[PDB]
Amino acid sequence: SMNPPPPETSNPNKPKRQTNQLQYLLRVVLKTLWKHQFAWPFQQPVDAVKLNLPDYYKIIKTPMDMGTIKKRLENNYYWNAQECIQDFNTMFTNCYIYNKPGDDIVLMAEALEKLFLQKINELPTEE
Ligand SMILES: C[C@H]1C(=O)N(C)C=Cc2cc(OCCOc3ccc4c(c3)C=CN(C)C(=O)[C@@H]4C)ccc21
């Protein structure tokens, strides 16, 4: 009945690189989903204490959110765009694992997921 610590977002021992796929992911992909009307429940880790969700982290063992993804992006944590995408894909799937199909938070996730997929359907070819 406590929050876990957040996922790792910095590690200086990890190699850094700037590519156009990571920049796209931040500048286009994360911007877009961040400012979307449904983004608000996903901009930080599920606060299972504040939200009164003791069982959240009894069911979700691989948590992820768009704030952790920002901190990862901005902190040059990712080497591969697919590491980012998987994180976005964990975010959604966690929502679908925890919540009841068809409620509101799942509907919210499904439209953000459709926005995400579209943008990723034409991520930049590596320059
Ligand atoms: C009709 C309308 C309404 O009546 N009003 C007033 C306006 C908006 C409004 C909002 C609503 O927001 C629902 C959000 O519910 C949840 C459920 C579960 C979780 C979250 C949020 C938070 C984060 N995450 C990622 C989770 O997975 C946890 C477990 C629903 C209805 C309305």
Side-chain angles (χ1 to χ4, degrees), residues 11-17 76-79:
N11 188 303
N13 294 333
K14 299 187 55 163
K16 283 79 171 63
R17 68 174 195 164
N76 307 274
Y77 181 94
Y78 305 110
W79 194 260

Side-chain angles (χ1 to χ4, degrees), residues 95-108 110:
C95 193
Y96 310 148
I97 286 177
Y98 185 69
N99 297 279
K100 304 195 280 278
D103 264 12
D104 265 1
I105 189 50
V106 162
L107 303 179
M108 286 171 76
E110 283 179 352

Side-chain angles (χ1 to χ4, degrees), residues 48-103:
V49 164
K50 300 308 182 303
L51 305 210
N52 208 340
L53 301 170
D55 292 352
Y56 189 67
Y57 289 100
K58 288 190 186 73
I59 292 149
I60 301 315
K61 305 318 213 334
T62 313
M64 192 56 52
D65 63 77
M66 293 205 298
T68 295
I69 287 166
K70 192 187 174 274
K71 311 261 199 84
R72 290 177 164 226
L73 282 170
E74 65 202 17
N75 297 337
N76 307 274
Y77 181 94
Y78 305 110
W79 194 260
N80 292 334
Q82 293 273 61
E83 294 169 80
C84 189
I85 279 163
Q86 171 199 129
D87 288 346
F88 275 106
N89 284 327
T90 305
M91 178 169 87
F92 302 133
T93 304
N94 281 346
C95 193
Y96 310 148
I97 286 177
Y98 185 69
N99 297 279
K100 304 195 280 278
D103 264 12

